[PDB]
Structures are given as C-alpha cells and as structure tokens.
Ligand binder design. Structure first.
Ligand SMILES: C[C@H](C[C@@H](C[C@H](C[C@@H](C[C@@H](CCN1CCCC1=O)N1CCCC1=O)N1CCCC1=O)N1CCCC1=O)N1CCCC1=O)N1CCCC1=O
Ligand SMILES: C[C@H](C[C@@H](C[C@H](C[C@@H](C[C@@H](CCN1CCCC1=O)N1CCCC1=O)N1CCCC1=O)N1CCCC1=O)N1CCCC1=O)N1CCCC1=O
Ligand SMILES: C[C@H](C[C@@H](C[C@H](C[C@@H](C[C@@H](CCN1CCCC1=O)N1CCCC1=O)N1CCCC1=O)N1CCCC1=O)N1CCCC1=O)N1CCCC1=O
Ligand SMILES: C[C@H](C[C@@H](C[C@H](C[C@@H](C[C@@H](CCN1CCCC1=O)N1CCCC1=O)N1CCCC1=O)N1CCCC1=O)N1CCCC1=O)N1CCCC1=O
Ligand SMILES: C[C@H](C[C@@H](C[C@H](C[C@@H](C[C@@H](CCN1CCCC1=O)N1CCCC1=O)N1CCCC1=O)N1CCCC1=O)N1CCCC1=O)N1CCCC1=O
Ligand SMILES: C[C@H](C[C@@H](C[C@H](C[C@@H](C[C@@H](CCN1CCCC1=O)N1CCCC1=O)N1CCCC1=O)N1CCCC1=O)N1CCCC1=O)N1CCCC1=O
Ligand SMILES: C[C@H](C[C@@H](C[C@H](C[C@@H](C[C@@H](CCN1CCCC1=O)N1CCCC1=O)N1CCCC1=O)N1CCCC1=O)N1CCCC1=O)N1CCCC1=O
Ligand SMILES: C[C@H](C[C@@H](C[C@H](C[C@@H](C[C@@H](CCN1CCCC1=O)N1CCCC1=O)N1CCCC1=O)N1CCCC1=O)N1CCCC1=O)N1CCCC1=O
Ligand SMILES: CC(C)(NC(=O)OCc1ccccc1)c1nc(C(=O)NCCn2cnc3c(N)ncnc32)c(O)c(=O)[nH]1
Ligand SMILES: CC(C)(NC(=O)OCc1ccccc1)c1nc(C(=O)NCCn2cnc3c(N)ncnc32)c(O)c(=O)[nH]1
Ligand SMILES: CC(C)(NC(=O)OCc1ccccc1)c1nc(C(=O)NCCn2cnc3c(N)ncnc32)c(O)c(=O)[nH]1
Ligand SMILES: CC(C)(NC(=O)OCc1ccccc1)c1nc(C(=O)NCCn2cnc3c(N)ncnc32)c(O)c(=O)[nH]1
Ligand SMILES: CC(C)(NC(=O)OCc1ccccc1)c1nc(C(=O)NCCn2cnc3c(N)ncnc32)c(O)c(=O)[nH]1
Ligand SMILES: CC(C)(NC(=O)OCc1ccccc1)c1nc(C(=O)NCCn2cnc3c(N)ncnc32)c(O)c(=O)[nH]1
Ligand SMILES: [Mn+2]
Ligand SMILES: [Mn+2]
Ligand SMILES: [Mn+2]
Ligand SMILES: [Mn+2]
Ligand SMILES: [Mn+2]
Ligand SMILES: [Mn+2]
Ligand SMILES: [Mn+2]
Ligand SMILES: [Mn+2]
Ligand SMILES: [Mn+2]
Ligand SMILES: [Mn+2]
Lengths: 179, 179, 179, 179, 179, 179, 179, 179
C-alpha cells in the first residue's frame, strides 16, 4: 500500500486511471508496485487527451489508450486512407490537418535527452515528435508545435500543478529518480 | 444464427443497428438472414451520420434513417422552402450551404461502377452524388466533395477499420461477393 | 377532446407545449378549447427558439416564453445596459450583435398583411420586425434578416413540414381560417 | 432567518451558493448573518463564471471559487509555465490569450472609487483589472476590456436584473449601504 | 415580492411548487399575492404525497395534484372498477386496500373545527376523512388512521419542522391568521 | 393520418408504443392503418406489464413484447427448467410461484365469449387463462386470479380511464365494433 | 499533504467526505491537519448511514450530517410530534419504531470505556446508546441492538475492512493512539 | 477473431464482460483466445450476481468479481466479524442469514462430478457448496439450497437460454468439450 498509489487514484480522472491500469497490466506491471510508472502513464494519458482536445473538434485521432490490437488496426486504417508510412513503434495521435502521426513524450530530463531517446528509436522519423516536461519546456520536430499557443500552455500548467501536489506529499523526489 | 449478425451488433452503434433493422424490415428483409445487406445498411447509415456531422453544426438535413413517409415529408418541405426540383428516388442529405440534395453511396466496386449505377438512376441528376469505398476512393459530382478534407478522411479511415475487423473474422470475403 | 389538441401534444416538444399552456392560461384561454391558437403559440415558441439558436451561442436573449413579470424585468435590464428605447409591447428577442430588440411573427396571410398588423402597433418601430410564413416567405425591417441564410431556411422547412402533417389529418384548413 | 438569505438561495445557482458558503466560512463569516456579503460573493462568483465563459472555450483559467491552497497552487503553475510575476493578492482569472492575470470587481460605487480601491492594493499592477457595476459601467486597465462587446453586455444585463429583483423585495437599499 | 413567496420556493420540492402554482392559477389566484394559500396548497400537496408513499408501493391512487378533468376521469374509473359511490367534491386519494376514497386536510385550528368543516360538506360521508395539524394531532373517521404509526409520525414531524422555519422568518403568525 | 394514431401515441408509454409497432409490423400490419388493433396491442402490452409488476419483484417472466424467436427461446428454457408442457400458441407470462404459464386477454365482449375464444384454441389448456375487460370483469381459470386484489383493481381502473379518454374524442365506438 | 488525507478521500464516498469536511470546519478543524479525526468523522458518518439504511425504508430519521441549526430543528419537530424528552447533546438518529433517539459511537477502546464516556455525558440517558468498534464488539442500552442481526454484521465487516486497508498503508497505528 | 468472442460480448452485460476480461487477464489468459473459458467466467459471474440478488436486499456479500487482494480483505473482515473459519480457496459469497460462505459452481458434467471436483478441494468443507448446470440440476450441501424456489428457477432458466443461443450459432458443442 503505497502513498503514491493513493495520490494517483485521487489526482487523475477515473477513466484515465483505469486505462493506465489496463495498459500497465497488459505489458506486465503492477500499479500497486511500479507506482512511479503508474503516475507516469496516467500523466502521459492525460497529456495526450488534452492534446487531442486542443485544436479542432475532430482534428486528431487517439492511438494511445486503446487496446494493442485495436490501436494497430486504427493505424493501418489511417495509413491506407491517406498514404503515410506505417510507423515502427505505436504512435500516440494522428493529425488529419497535417496528415502526420504524432509521438507525445513527457519526461523529467531536458527536452534534449528525451528527444534524443525518441528520435533514434523512431529511426525513419517520418512521424512528428513532441516532448513536454514538468519544467515547462517542449521540443518538437522542425519547431512545429502543431497546437495553438493557448492549448499548449494549458498542458504545461497542468503538468506543473501535478509536480506541486507531489511535492506537498514528499513524493516528487522519488518520481524524479525513476526516469 | 450468423457470425456476421453478431459482428454487426457488436460493431455498430445500437441506434444505427436499430434503424437498420427497421429499414430492412420495412422493405421486406430479415437482418438475421440477409446479413450482408444488414452490415451494408448499418455502414451506409453510419457514413451518412458522420457526413452530416462534418461541416457546420446545422448545415445538413438527414433524410436517410427516417420513416419512408416522414422522410418524404421533409423532402417536400425543403423543396418548397428553397426551390429545388423534387428528387425521384429518396436522397440521403440536403446541403443548406449549397442548396442541393446529396446521395451518399458506399460500394465494394470502383468509384466508377458505383457512380454509374447511381447517375443513370438519378436520370435528371439535379442532386449531387457522393461515393465512398472500403478501399478509400471517392467520386463526387463535378469533383465537388462538399466536405472538408479532414472530415472525409475520418469517414474513409472508419470504412477501412471496419473492413479490417471483418477480415479478422473471415467474414470480409463473403461481404465482397454480395455486391 | 379535439384532434388538434392531440396533434399539438404529439408534434411539439414537451417543454414548448408546457410553456404554451402556461402563456395561454395566463392570458385567459383553454388549450383544450382555443386549440388553433394552441398550435399557433406552440409554433411561435418553437420558431423563436430556433431563431435564438441560429447565430452565435450567446448572441440572443429570449424574451418570449418567460413569465410576464420576469420577461419585462429582463427588458428593463437590457434597456439600462445598452441604452435602447423601452418597447411598448413585449418583444421576443434582443440581438446583442445589432443592439436591437426583435419581434418575431408567424402568420397565414402574406408577409405584407402581417407586417402591416405589426408595424402600426409598434408605432415607434425602434425595434426590428421579422415575419415568417407557412408558405416560406419572410419580410423583415430594412430587408435585414439578422440571421444566416442557412438558419432561416431551417426555420421555414420546419414551418412547412408542420403544415404538411396538419393536412395529413385534415386539420390544416381549420388553422387557415382562424387567423 | 433573513429575507435575503432566502433570496440568495432562490436567485443564484446551487453550485455558486455552495461555493459562496464555503469561501465565506473559510474566511470566518456566516451566510445566515453577513447576508449582504453573501449576495455579494455569490454575484462575484457568477460574474467571474460568465466572464471565463465569454471568449474561447479554453481561454481562461478560473482562480476564484477554488480552495485557498489549490487556487495558489494553480497560480504558481501558471507563473512558472508562462513567466509572469506572481501576484500579491489572489487574482480571479488568467487570460492565456493575453498572458496576464485578471482581477474582477463588482461594486456599488462608481467605477472610479472601486478601481482606486483595487489599484493601490495591487501596488505593482502587473495584472489586469476589470470592474463591473450594478449601474452598467466598467473600468478596465488601459481601456482593454478583454472580452467581446456581446459577452460584457450579457454580464451587465444580469447584474441589473439582479438589482431589480432585489428592489421587488425592498432589499436593494440595504445592499447599497453595506459597501 | 413577498418574503413567503421565496420561502415557499426554497422550502418545498420544485415539482410540488409547480403543481401548486398550476392549481392556484387554475382556480384563479396568484401565488405572488395569495402567498399564504400558496404555502398552504404546497403543504397539502406534500402531505398527500407522503401519505400515498406510506403503506404499500401501489396501495394508493393520487387524485390531488392532477388536472381537474383528469382527476375526475380517474375518479370515475375507480368508481366503475370497484363499485363505490361517486364523491361530491374531488377527493385526494383512494385506498385500494380499504376500497375507499380519502380526503386529507391540513389545518391551523383544532382537529375538531377542521373535521367539522369537512364532514358536513361531505354530506354523505361515504368517503374517509383524515385531518392533520401543525400542532401534531389528527382526527380520522371511525378512528381508523389508515396508515402505519411510523408513516404518520413522519408526516407530523415534517409539518412541524415547516412551522419552525416559518417562525425563524417571522412569517408563522401571518399564516395562522389566514385560515 | 388518423385521430387514433395520435391518441395512441399520446396515451401510452413510448416503449410500449414502439413494441406495438414492432409486433404489428412483424405480423404484417400498419399502425397508421389498422389503428384499432394498434390501440389494442398497446393496451395488451401495458396490461401484461402491470400484471408482471404486481406481485413479487421477480415472480413473473415476460413472454409478450419480445421477438418471436427470442420469446420462444425463453419458453423452451422455462419448460426445460421446471418441467411444464410446451404451449401451443405463445403465452404471455410464466408464474414461477405457481409454476405455470399465463395467457392474458383484453376484450370488448363479455368475459365468457373471450374466454371461449381462448380456451378451445388452448386445446390442452395446461396453461392458465386470465381475461380482462374495459367494463371491469375478469374470468380466470379455476377462479384463481393469481394476483392480489389490489394489483388487479389497478389494472381495471387503468383499462377504464383509457375507455373514457377514447369517448372524449368520439373514438370509443369505432373501437367497440372492431373486435 | 498527509498520507491519510488521501486515503480518506479515496476510501469513503464523496458525499460523506464532503459532509465530514463541512462538520469539521464548522467546529473549527482542518481535515488537512486533524486528519485522524477526519477519518473518524467519515467513519462515524458512514456507520450512521448504514444504520439508518438497515431496517425499514422509512424507520429512522438522520440527525447527524445535517447543519447544526437544521439538525436541532428536526429534533424539536420529532420531540413535539411524539412526546420524547429533548436530548442534551445532539443525537444521531431517531427510531420511529421504538419512539426513541439513538446515539451511535465508533471507538478504538473497548465497548465498556466508550459506553462509559457516553452514558455519563448523556446524564438523563432517556435516549438509546449504541457503540461499535473496529474489533467487532457492540454495547447497547438494555442489550437492545435495535437492528437485525444481518444489518449489524454488515456494519462491523465494513469497520474491519477499513482497519485492514489502513494497516496496508502503515496508518492504522497512528489512528489507534489518537483516541 | 472468434465467433464466440463476439457472442460473449453481445450476450452478457458490459460490466460482467469487463470483469471477466479483468479476472482472466489477472490469472494469465486472453479472452480473444481462451474464449470458452471467457464464456464460462462470464456465466459464472452472472450466476453469482443473480444469486446475491435473490433473497433479501442485503443478505449476501459478493466475493467473486473483486480484485484478488480486495476480495481476500473482505473475507478476513467477515471472518473476524462473525467468527467463521478462513476458507482455503477464495469463496464466491457469504450468507449473513446463515453465517456461512458459499461456493458457486456452473458445470457441463453432472452435479455429482462437479460437486466431487469441489468438495475434496474444499477439504475442510466448512463453507457451503452450490452447483448449477446447463441441464437444470443443482447439488448443494446438506440439500440446503439457501435461496427461494423462485430465484433458483430464474437462474437455471437463464443458464438454459444461454445454451440455446449457443446452439443457434453452432458454438455449444465446442463449449461442452472444453470442460
Ligand atoms: C477526453 C478523453 C476522451 C477519449 C476516450 C474516450 C472513451 N472511450 C473508452 C473506449 C471507447 C471510448 O471512446 N478514449 C480513451 C481510449 C481512446 C479514446 O477515444 N473522452 C473521454 C470522455 C469522452 C471522450 O471523448 N479527455 C480530455 C481531457 C481529459 C479527458 O478525459
Ligand atoms: C449522430 C446521429 C444523429 C441522428 C439521429 C437522431 C436520433 N433520432 C431518432 C429519431 C428522432 C431523432 O432525432 N437521426 C436518425 C434518424 C434521423 C436523425 O436525425 N444523432 C444521434 C444522437 C443525437 C443525434 O443527433 N451520429 C453521428 C456519428 C454516429 C451517430 O450516431
Ligand atoms: C432550446 C430552447 C431553450 C430555451 C428555454 C430554456 C428552458 N428554461 C425554462 C425556464 C428557465 C430556462 O432556462 N427557455 C424557455 C423560457 C426562456 C428560455 O430560456 N432551451 C431548452 C433546453 C435548454 C435551452 O437552452 N430550443 C431550440 C430548439 C427547440 C428548443 O427547445
Ligand atoms: C460555469 C461554472 C463552471 C466552473 C466550476 C466547475 C465546477 N467544479 C467544482 C470543483 C471542481 C470543478 O471543476 N468551477 C468552480 C471552482 C472552479 C471551477 O472550475 N462550471 C460549472 C459546471 C461545469 C463548469 O465548467 N458557469 C458559467 C455560468 C454560470 C456557471 O455555473
Ligand atoms: C412523490 C410524488 C409522486 C407523484 C407525482 C408524479 C409526477 N407526475 C407528474 C404528472 C404525471 C406524473 O406521474 N404526481 C403528481 C400528479 C399526480 C402524481 O402522480 N412522484 C414524483 C416523482 C415520481 C413520483 O411518483 N413524492 C412523495 C414525497 C414527496 C414527493 O415528491
Ligand atoms: C415495465 C415494463 C418492463 C419490461 C420491458 C423491459 C425493457 N426491455 C426492452 C428489451 C430488453 C428489455 O429488458 N420489456 C419489454 C420486452 C420484454 C421486457 O422485459 N420494463 C420497462 C422499463 C424497465 C422494465 O423492467 N412497465 C410496467 C408498467 C408499464 C411499464 O413500462
Ligand atoms: C445513504 C446516505 C443518505 C443520506 C443523505 C442524503 C443526502 N442529502 C444531502 C442534504 C439533503 C439530503 O437529503 N443525508 C446526509 C445529510 C442528511 C441526509 O439525509 N443518502 C445519500 C444518497 C440519497 C440518500 O438517501 N447512504 C447509506 C450508505 C452510504 C450512503 O451514502
Ligand atoms: C448486479 C451486479 C452488482 C454487483 C457489482 C457492483 C459494481 N461495482 C464495481 C466495483 C465496485 C462496485 O460496486 N459488483 C462487481 C464487483 C463486486 C460487486 O459488488 N451490481 C451492478 C450494478 C449495481 C450492483 O449492485 N447484477 C445482478 C444481475 C446482473 C447484474 O449485473
Ligand atoms: C443499396 C442500398 C444499401 N439499398 C442503399 N439504399 C439507399 C436508400 O436510400 N434506400 C431507400 C429506398 N429503398 C427502396 N427499396 C429499398 C430496399 N429494398 N432496401 C433499402 N432501401 C430501399 C441508399 O441511399 C444507399 O446509398 N444504398
Ligand atoms: C470584496 C470581496 C467580495 N471580499 C472580494 N473578494 C475577492 C477575493 O479574491 N478574496 C480572496 C481572499 N480573501 C481574503 N480575505 C477574504 C475575506 N475576508 N472574504 C473573502 N475573500 C477573502 C475578490 O476577488 C473580489 O472581487 N471581491
Ligand atoms: C382548503 C384548500 C387548501 N383549498 C384545499 N383544497 C382541496 C381540494 O381538493 N381542492 C380542489 C377543488 N377546488 C375547488 N375550488 C378550489 C380553489 N378555489 N382552490 C383550490 N382547490 C379548489 C383539498 O383537498 C384540501 O385538503 N384543501
Ligand atoms: C388478439 C391479439 C391482440 N392479436 C392478441 N395477440 C396475442 C399474441 O400473443 N400474439 C402473438 C402471435 N401472433 C400471431 N399472429 C399475430 C398477429 N397477426 N398479430 C399479433 N400477434 C400475433 C395475445 O397474447 C393477446 O392477448 N391478444
Ligand atoms: C467524537 C466525535 C467524532 N466528535 C463524535 N461527535 C459526534 C457529534 O454528534 N458531534 C456533534 C457536536 N459537536 C460539538 N462539538 C464538536 C466537535 N468539536 N466536533 C464534532 N462534532 C461536534 C458524535 O455523534 C459521535 O458519535 N462522535
Ligand atoms: C473453474 C473457474 C471458471 N476457473 C472458476 N473459478 C472460480 C474462482 O473463484 N477463481 C478464483 C481464483 N483463481 C485462481 N486461479 C484462477 C484462474 N486460473 N482462473 C480464474 N480464477 C482463478 C470459481 O469460484 C468458479 O466457480 N469457477
Ligand atoms: Mn507517447
Ligand atoms: Mn445513399
Ligand atoms: Mn412575436
Ligand atoms: Mn475579484
Ligand atoms: Mn384534501
Ligand atoms: Mn401474447
Ligand atoms: Mn395474451
Ligand atoms: Mn452525532
Ligand atoms: Mn454519534
Ligand atoms: Mn465459484
């Protein structure tokens, strides 16, 4: 029974917490144990949701937060629809405005180290990359940040008020060393 | 008890499935038997709904998915309102922006054969024609596709993820030979 | 027990029917008896609602369908707020975009006779006037129709599909002679 | 058991009344006793809510109506996010469009006396100031009123219809002398 | 704008207040004016509802709170169904357990004076009579109180907590002199 | 467009009206045409629902108002479960308390003629029979009326208030001659 | 930011947690600080709710969890209704079956020490007393436990599964020393 | 993509299907693969739910369908509460009326072979055992079937209508050979 298991349950939305439990258990982890990654994948889920929420009402297509098999199914459908190269690892969104997939990251290092962790794994980085941080910075491909200046500020404000409430419970430092 | 009767029930929205059952029974068919056309008229209904959803909030007027008599009633009302020629077969939508009716098709042939099946039956093609396909192509009158580029991609992505889930159950090939 | 009492109940929205009953009883009439004016004030209510619905989300202020005293209260508040002359009879809407009140009419004569019935009663016609008809015409002050071309077509289409369903029950002719 | 305790309960929205009770009790007052300030902080809450409602869907961030500690938490998060000076007293909103905090006032004096009460207390008035009145005037920093002309008229119309219903119960004069 | 108009709105359930407004206006009175009888018919409605609630789930048939015409319609239906004498004034309930109509009263005199006011008007008192009071007494025909001892205590407790909240606002004495 | 089509829509519950439309169309009839049988099968449905409602919470199993195939499926399941003879025509309910099927009738003749119409068609009347009437009588097998005296009175009261509202619209006499 | 503040939020029902916050703040305490008594008054609230839930549907009258003033108001109403001595400290329930008030306790000592803490403070113990414990014992006046044997077991099972989840987070021992 | 994966999704309640997916994945199985046990644990869940539903409103305590850890937590709480021996394998219910745990089984063999599979594994069969079957038989400890005769018939009727719909799709025989 961890302090942060409770904080994750009380902090995020019940649907997001349920999807995080499902994804973590599908890839072999216990939210009651690997609690730091529990908070991480909750945060990642929420950031992706607010991202797809920013912009037009039906501009994005959510890939993260689905079943493995179904997420892939969507990716193949989009690929055949428009004519984009099938990604290598599962992306997080697809911009219909820019006809391109989007990988969303949330890290505790600088934008540079996280972007480096993601770009080489992307290899053929035919799909866009967008990083966020609990400090407030964001590195994105070709400095195209996709979203409005107001939607992105909302996301970082949220990222930081999470970091605050974690420090109020002396759980922030353990989160910083896990990544 | 057919496999695709279940797949149609689990795949589409309950309202769409109910309207498909109602329309098929009104024109003398059993969704438990003519199952391929069950999936077809479910798909047609859903595509029409997403179409009227794309664009402005109150830009389209749904004609398909109503009672025979009531659908006609609406058509006469629109006709008298604006001043457009009363169609010959029941159309699917009316664009208030373009002051014109719209016939929506979803086929398993090329855009050409379906468009040919529809245009001669339209005779006096005073009303627009718009075709869609499980491959991803679309033929439309005067190459005016009515909707935004992003709303139409959504529709075709959906059409294709349906085709996928059908192949996952070995039901796609039977669908292809029915049309 | 009249045929059109039932048709009015089954045709319009329950809230609109309830507000019509309330207004008619407040001004001394029985919806079970003066049934033609029952259908009339239902239609008037619905047309006003769709009107305030067309345009921006918070562009109009509904005056009809409120309590006598409260409706007036709103009018005084708007008057003091912007600086417009207090109307003489209770108006139906207020356009915040055009800073002007709006009187909405729905008649069975021509636009001319109804507009004449309303303008002289307006006397100091400082407030806008907008007429609608079951035929499909509309006369408005200075030929400024306030709303988009698509929102107004919706209203007239609705007005006409009502006229149809009335004729399907042989109740239209009695409606035409009541005005 | 005061007349205006009832009028406040019947006039405002239950959520707003509950938040007003919570804030007043947190800062040591009884809504059953300091009833004038009960109506005041209800009005202030509602005006702030309509303000954040005017404009874009996610343009503002509500600071008033939260817990003391949580409200501050949000302020620190916004501050770190964009890079604005941390206010001195707790502000009411943050404009993401204009990257600036907003203090909303509702007074019974002129715009001048209220604006004077707020500006010197702001000291380093790095954050915007916006006043409203039951008469209908509004003074704002640099004459930038932030919102559309139609959203602001709505607010003042509401402020005045409240003043009316108060006079209908002979409670307005007691409200005027409390400030 | 009366104090007790507000107290009635804030004290009773919105459906009960709406039905009271409807009945009072149907029999020619203004809840904003004849406010004491407003509170009275609200109380009468609520007492009848709790009465029909006490006992079995489908033991009673509500007659009060319906439209004049419809209430009568129900009475005729019950009369023909069982075989009971058609009442003279409109009763409030029908006990299916005891096969008898019930008239419910709520007074500010003693049980004796109210029971006397009701019995002679009943003339052929073929239907049961049940009185309640803000003091807590109850006179009933043949001392048959119909309901359980626990359901009736609930009703009187409610009647008295209303009398209290009225005294908290100095409105009780005006209520006592109106009857 | 019939008067009673409207009266049926406004009188019964939308679910019951929908199930009646479905059953009538499944057995080849138009509710807009065979309107008398529309009202009949609505009434039959409602009476069956109130019947299964009377008694214990899970005492009855509804057979009428289901799909043909599914209704039969249930019947076979009950038959195998308890050990009762499979009926010949589709029954309406099954009493789990009395381990016996129940056929519910609603007629405009006497209990005798309707009971005679049903018993010979039952042939091997191994299943119970229960008749109801718009007059208020009821004939049942072995004079076992299954339900409480209070639940059955409710049903007949409802049957009669329907007959009243029909006479208020001069539609009752046409109903009486159709059976 | 305490561990048990989170555990209390995630463990109990949001309404109960809100009422506990309200009562604690009304009697001058911070749920973010006096967290042990936060969990205590949450538990007390929940136990009282399940108690009033056990037994008949309308057998009990809830006194705890109301506003101070309103709770008293109810007590006076019950007192006048039945004829019971007005308690000295605010009781928790009133049994309408047994015509007596009930004080509910939940302690971490034995039933004896808690019962002793309550009885002398009751002085004139005209009202019933009922104790519960996280161990599972219960002392009650005259060994009359009021409720069924099954409703009381439910309460103690719940009390103990709370004690378990507290030990899973190493928060139980701090709870035991606070009383 | 299996036929019975679809049939399980369309046949059972979404909550039950979700809990079955969760339990199967927690004990290392894929509902898309071990589909027969998918239908099995769905059926087991539903039978347990109807069982706890039969009888008194709060007579049973559900153990199956919870998290492993939480289910155990409840068991320990009940054990300490009443004083029953802690079971060895996780039971399904606890009867508060009979103060005893209950293991529910649903098999495709005879009651004898399933009861034999369960009793020796129970070893110290201090807890009750209750078997059900798609044929309709039931073996229970000491021939005490716990529930009413009507609630148990409901369960078996449901078990058999499932077996029917499975045969309608030629999936029953594969289910019979899996156990
Ligand atoms: C909105 C999140 C957004 C996305 C949900 C939909 C829920 N699910 C569940 C499966 C089917 C489905 O559709 N998910 C998650 C899986 C893919 C997807 O689309 N939600 C939730 C409510 C409706 C909606 O759109 N946001 C944005 C801010 C925080 C938040 O919750
Ligand atoms: C929205 C579909 C859309 C259209 C429905 C409304 C439902 N009905 C039923 C009869 C009266 C009525 O209005 N239909 C169908 C008949 C004509 C019509 O308008 N719906 C459904 C919810 C509200 C709404 O607008 N979409 C778009 C994507 C998939 C989907 O379901
Ligand atoms: C929307 C109508 C619109 C206006 C209603 C709000 C309901 N009421 C009742 C009193 C308080 C209040 O607000 N009324 C009527 C009185 C003034 C007013 O505002 N409605 C209804 C749902 C929410 C909303 O906005 N439309 C447009 C098309 C048809 C229709 O019903
Ligand atoms: C909308 C008000 C607006 C703001 C509410 C959200 C409610 N709460 C409660 C705590 C968590 C939370 O979110 N509050 C208040 C605290 C900060 C905040 O955001 N509301 C209410 C409904 C949904 C929504 O957005 N308006 C505008 C006009 C009048 C009105 O009520
Ligand atoms: C329950 C009151 C009870 C009676 C209502 C039903 C509402 N209406 C409105 C017209 C059609 C209809 O049915 N009315 C009033 C008219 C006759 C009738 O039956 N209500 C209300 C909720 C559901 C229900 O049963 N109680 C008891 C305690 C206080 C209270 O509100
Ligand atoms: C209650 C009627 C009762 C029966 C309905 C359930 C609705 N449906 C639809 C299909 C699946 C399903 O379950 N039907 C009809 C088919 C068989 C059945 O069971 N209803 C309706 C609400 C919930 C419920 O139980 N009553 C009694 C008085 C009038 C009335 O409507
Ligand atoms: C049921 C609790 C019960 C009591 C609530 C009602 C809510 N409120 C809020 C104020 C007006 C009001 O009525 N309260 C609390 C104050 C007095 C009272 O009555 N609730 C809640 C839902 C409906 C209901 O009855 N239970 C029992 C188990 C746990 C639980 O929550
Ligand atoms: C009622 C099932 C019953 C039990 C559910 C409650 C849902 N959950 C989810 C977790 C917290 C919780 O409580 N579960 C499942 C886990 C233990 C438990 O209690 N349900 C569901 C609705 C409310 C309720 O009581 N039935 C009986 C017939 C079929 C059916 O669905
Ligand atoms: C080809 C298909 C799926 N059929 C189809 N139908 C329509 C349509 O409008 N049908 C209305 C009239 N109609 C007459 N006879 C009918 C019948 N037997 N089945 C259904 N509908 C019938 C489309 O618009 C469309 O794109 N595809
Ligand atoms: C003047 C008024 C109504 N009060 C008011 N208050 C605020 C506000 O933010 N208050 C937060 C901090 N605060 C500190 N002490 C407080 C106290 N005693 N009462 C309330 N709030 C207190 C406004 O923004 C505003 O426009 N008007
Ligand atoms: C005394 C009181 C409150 N009035 C009262 N009324 C009724 C009642 O049934 N009224 C129905 C018929 N009715 C005729 N004229 C009416 C009118 N002027 N006002 C209202 N109702 C009128 C009661 O049952 C009851 O207990 N108390
Ligand atoms: C007499 C009435 C109203 N009809 C009636 N029907 C049933 C019934 O069960 N019908 C099921 C089978 N069925 C076969 N042919 C049918 C057809 N043409 N119309 C409807 N139902 C048909 C009753 O139970 C009942 O009381 N009254
Ligand atoms: C011991 C405990 C948890 N406290 C408790 N309280 C009550 C109760 O009724 N309290 C109402 C009055 N009250 C006065 N001063 C108060 C204060 N400082 N905190 C809270 N309540 C206060 C119980 O009934 C009960 O079982 N346990
Ligand atoms: C035989 C069946 C369907 N399985 C079954 N299971 C249970 C049960 O409680 N299981 C809990 C523990 N458990 C341990 N290993 C497990 C595993 N591999 N799958 C599932 N559950 C597992 C029943 O009660 C019952 O009637 N039938
Ligand atoms: Mn990502
Ligand atoms: Mn089409
Ligand atoms: Mn008008
Ligand atoms: Mn402010
Ligand atoms: Mn009465
Ligand atoms: Mn039948
Ligand atoms: Mn029948
Ligand atoms: Mn207490
Ligand atoms: Mn207590
Ligand atoms: Mn089991």
């Amino acid at each position: 029974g961890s302090h942060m298991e409770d904080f994750v349950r009380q902090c995020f939305n019940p649907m997001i917490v349920e999807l995080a439990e499902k994804a973590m258990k599908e890839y072999g982890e216990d939210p009651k144990i690997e609690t730091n990654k529990f908070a991480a994948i909750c945060t990642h889920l929420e950031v992706c949701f607010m991202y797809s929420d920013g912009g037009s009402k039906h501009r994005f297509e959510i890939i993260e937060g689905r079943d493995r098999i179904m997420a892939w199914t969507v990716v193949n459908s989009i690929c055949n629809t428009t004519g984009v190269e099938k990604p290598k690892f599962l992306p997080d969104l697809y911009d219909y405005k820019e006809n391109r997939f989007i990988e969303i990251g949330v890290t505790r290092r600088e934008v540079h180290i996280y972007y480096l962790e993601k770009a080489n794994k992307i290899k053929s980085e035919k799909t866009h990359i967008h990083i966020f941080s609990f400090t407030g910075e964001e590195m994105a491909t070709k400095a195209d940040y996709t979203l409005d200046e107001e939607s992105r500020a909302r996301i970082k404000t949220r990222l930081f008020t999470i970091r605050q409430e974690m420090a109020s419970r002396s759980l922030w430092d353990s989160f910083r060393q896990s990544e």
